[PDB]
Known about the structure:
Oligomer: part of a larger assembly
PDB class: virus
Keywords: VLP, mature, stable, virus
Subcellular location (chain D): Host cytoplasm; Virion
Distance between the termini of chain A: 48 Å
Family (chain D): Belongs to the caliciviridae capsid protein family.
Number of helices of chain A: 3
Radius of gyration of chain A: 28 Å
Number of strands of chain A: 29
Protein name (chain D): Capsid protein VP1
Amino acid sequence: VPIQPVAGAALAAPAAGQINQIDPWIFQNFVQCPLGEFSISPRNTPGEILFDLALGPGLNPYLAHLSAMYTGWVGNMEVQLVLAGNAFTAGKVVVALVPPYFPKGSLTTAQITCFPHVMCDVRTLEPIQLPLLDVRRVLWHATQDQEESMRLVCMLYTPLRTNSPGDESFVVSGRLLSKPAADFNFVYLTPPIERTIYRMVDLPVLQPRLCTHARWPAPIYGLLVDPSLPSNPQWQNGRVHVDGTLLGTTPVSGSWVSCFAAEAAYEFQSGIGEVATFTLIEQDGSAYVPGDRAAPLGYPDFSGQLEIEVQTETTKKGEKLKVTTFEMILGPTTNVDQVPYQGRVYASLTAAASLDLVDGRVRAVPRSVYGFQDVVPEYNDGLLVPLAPPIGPFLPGEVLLRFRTYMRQIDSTDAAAEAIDCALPQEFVSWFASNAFTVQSEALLLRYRNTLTGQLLFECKLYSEGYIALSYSGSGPLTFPTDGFFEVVSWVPRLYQLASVG
Amino acid sequence: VPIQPVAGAALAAPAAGQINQIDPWIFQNFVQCPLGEFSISPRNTPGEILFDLALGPGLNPYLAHLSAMYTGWVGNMEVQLVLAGNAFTAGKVVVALVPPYFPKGSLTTAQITCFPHVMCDVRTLEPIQLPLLDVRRVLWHATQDQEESMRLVCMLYTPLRTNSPGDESFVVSGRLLSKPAADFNFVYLTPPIERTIYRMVDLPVLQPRLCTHARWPAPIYGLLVDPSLPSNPQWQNGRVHVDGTLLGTTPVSGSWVSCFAAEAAYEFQSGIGEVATFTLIEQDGSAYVPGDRAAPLGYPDFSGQLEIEVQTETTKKGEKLKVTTFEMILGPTTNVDQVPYQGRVYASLTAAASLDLVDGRVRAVPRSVYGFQDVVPEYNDGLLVPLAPPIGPFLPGEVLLRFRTYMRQIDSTDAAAEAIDCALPQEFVSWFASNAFTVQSEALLLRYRNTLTGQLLFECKLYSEGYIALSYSGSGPLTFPTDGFFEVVSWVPRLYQLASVG
Amino acid sequence: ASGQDLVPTAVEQAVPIQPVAGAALAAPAAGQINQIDPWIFQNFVQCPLGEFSISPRNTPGEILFDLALGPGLNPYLAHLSAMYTGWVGNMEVQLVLAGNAFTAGKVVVALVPPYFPKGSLTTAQITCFPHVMCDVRTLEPIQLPLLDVRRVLWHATQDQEESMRLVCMLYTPLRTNSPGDESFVVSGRLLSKPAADFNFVYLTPPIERTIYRMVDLPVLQPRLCTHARWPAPIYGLLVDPSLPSNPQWQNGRVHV
Amino acid sequence: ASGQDLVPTAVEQAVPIQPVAGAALAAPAAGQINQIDPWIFQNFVQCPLGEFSISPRNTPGEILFDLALGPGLNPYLAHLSAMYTGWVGNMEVQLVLAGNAFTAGKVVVALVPPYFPKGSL
């Protein structure tokens, strides 16, 4: 590889304050990078990204762990590329060594082998040693800011042409193994850092039956998946990123969901009467400016006829405490002008005599629906509205698992006619929006691990748009016991093949 | 100091696998221990614990941070004792060096100066160097198990006799500053450890207005403190430890609180009628065995007349969906046999014609009370019951701050007659019971820090029985704006003097 | 050993940081030669910041000053930095702590690095940073370095520094031993000089709108002024605690 | 010379008594060999007696403490003396006097001999 460096730590050692050794035992293990696990299948046309792995302390667990107490780092990493292919499987693969500040728009096959690359092979026997020496623009990189460093871009080249057996296509699975060289050493030691850009997402050890639902205030009763239900829903509560940035109407509260706070108005009673006008604000004493939330925070996002309690400061025949039914059409039937996007909802009062009600600041908890459908409510007059996007593209063998609760409703036709679905419940939404992790990949592997037996129930990938997918080939419903704590393994890439669910 | 050691790392270096250096810059800073900050006031009779600081990597932030990637450690620490006292303040103080496996039952003044101690003085000018060399019983200590190591016990001796000015008693504030010696080095490097016994409690960056209340399903509206209210309440929801061990009826859910799941029975209608019997179980499909929880998880813990919704599978005149009032006396008035401890509650049905109801598994969300009192409900017939203990002893200048919500109720006498109080809301209960920290002290300092200005609103200590205290000298109510994220500083001891609140 | 002393006359605690080699790095970068003066050096001169009065009514987790390294630590270098762009930094900073032999208390300095968050600097963050703790009673001026640990060749003199800071925290708060009702609020004026290595890199014209210039108030009289709330001359400046001293009046107020 | 001092840092006034040669006398008497410990030595340790608080409300003919020489001057020797019969005595006793530079006053020690009446001192 033509690079020819001379120095990478003695350059920054003057203007560093203090440069710090690590220990001579971390410079001797090849411990694998978090997201460089590739698999060359023979049904892959050549010229695709196998991995794009930067420089940095986020290539070992040890450097990422120790780099939370320093202010930065210099020095050169080293890579052992290993491939799980014996003979009779020809086909090259190139590890190009792309510099910092090279744009990522396109990288075809005539572009890989134009860097100082190494053209290795699937048939190789010994592992492949390769330096990743940081071409700086500055003296030392900082460790709390992601920075344009040297990246290692691997791509197959004269692709894999091998003989495959029955029902098992021979993938050549390759791994990267990073190790800092003798040039790698951190700079000035700053001890207090609690939250870091190299921390791993953790997904706490709360049980999925002990956690609050993120779409309706009920404990989660089921944890199932349906290929017969639509695999691409457009939910607006329980949407989150792993970054912590919320999406849509989602509150960081289990008590705010499917509820709203407003200023009431009780006006009309002239023979048919019985209506109320709620001017929406916010559920923690704030205002309402219509931006991108499509509704105030925690507004009920489903089509039905929701009955809502209320706090009334009624003058005559009772104290300042009586609740009532308050039917409220959330559904597509626009009889009254239902618009939570301007923040004006209308609610029929009660089958009552005439009227005795007083306006004020109210907060309207829900209690029952009449007919549930999993479509979005009309937020503005039937017109469009800035929504959270639908749940993104899956691998075609995967469907999203969902977390069943059960509303209480009025049906008079059949019992338990509906159930409420979400992904990443409110104890994970309030987890992600409070820790605010820094993501590496777009997907994130999990293992569902029950407590008192340790049996791996399923593995599942948690996409960074905040939904958990699961590869179930089938067309029937199936459930899972709700006593397993979710636990991470690694930031797996987008097109990852998690095994199966039987 | 008479100890006379010879070696403390070369003993364990044979049976270690690999011993690991740290770097030569961590062995040069005196960075202070987490819980050794003492203050000798002149109104302190001699013979009291100033600090009892063990050995271990939990004496620096750097050793506690780096010790999460090793399997253990050996070696000797070193202590710089500094005191903030100039001349004219005589009075000695002894740092005794107590061995491992010495019982902590009593340590009088004739017991301190009977170890290999150092008898230093308040009037000293240079700081006080002192070794803390680990008297092992084993080869290397492990780093994931707390272990009986050498402890440094400081105690005053011929006490402080100084001249004090007006309204400021001259405390001699002393600090300990730990640093590992050249003998300190870790052993075999095990990289993956996420949760550690040396991790610091963190208290996430959720706003107190965006968090769900832990006693009633409503968003927190106020954050106030009252010296006129009783400073020692006995709450049963929202009780937690920093350890993660829950106390009483507290669920790890915002939706389970003040609610219960049961098997219903609808029997009696004979002229006055209108009663239902709920046999309690659990709110996530479990049983109920009466142990120490005093009620099922999330049972409403307050005295009143709670009206609760229900899901009814009614045969005639409607579908399997209609909700109703269900008055239920939680209060001290034992008309019907109210007992959630055996799991049998009774609820008057409805001012209804006669009866049409069908038994089944129900879950009874609350909607309104008639008269709120902050006393515990009768859990078993008026008899006693294994309860969570009342909120523990404060420093006499401190009262617990509390988190206001507002129920909706029936009063017909006055509006907003009551408000609901808790400490550590459900987004901190579900935080502590999911991280499950390891505690060092009994108290834990916080700083209330508003977001868009950074103004320190108050400092407050979070006791390890799970309640936040606040030193407000006064007799009037005062509130705080609910937009400040709580942030920790250190594990302060029990008898700590946080400043004031004006 | 000048005065008669029941106080610590000497602090030299050997702050553990490698000496940075500034101004031999940015000499090939800039296309100029720029000495400053050999008499702006060897002259300790008070910074236009950081005059800190420690009081007994201060918690020990409280910050006295937080000086970012820059030319805004002398009148001289803040005067020259109106011309130039860029500088390469070293300083010798002397704290002048005062207060009688009847005071007490410590205070930690901390050379906190540039890329550290400007949020919580608690009491327990003294072992992490290269620090020197200092008694309040001390008689000599406390000299200590203030060097830069930077990733660039020079820091641009407008809002582009992100450089190394001195954080002082009172580590043990000021209890006095005097048997009187006397205010022992220890007033300290620290003062900095550039080292033998501070220089400016490139020479731009002075614009007078510069950051950290010497603020000044108009020298007229206070009775020669128009009242900013009613059109009348000021008939008297005064104080009165009996009036409500958190007023909500709108006109007459301006951020400086 | 540790702290800053307006106080007498040193007292060494050369108490005039011949050094007694104990424990080479009672070694032929007892029929045993009995060392104690070489680490009970070189460790100054508080006696279970004599903690004296001088006050301004004290006449100058008043006694602060009267320690008889014995093994009841350490926790160690009073613990070992539950086993043994007999001892041969020497001690180094350190008084720890305190009080600021604003105090005054003297205090005399006195090695009063054994066969002296326990009345008027």
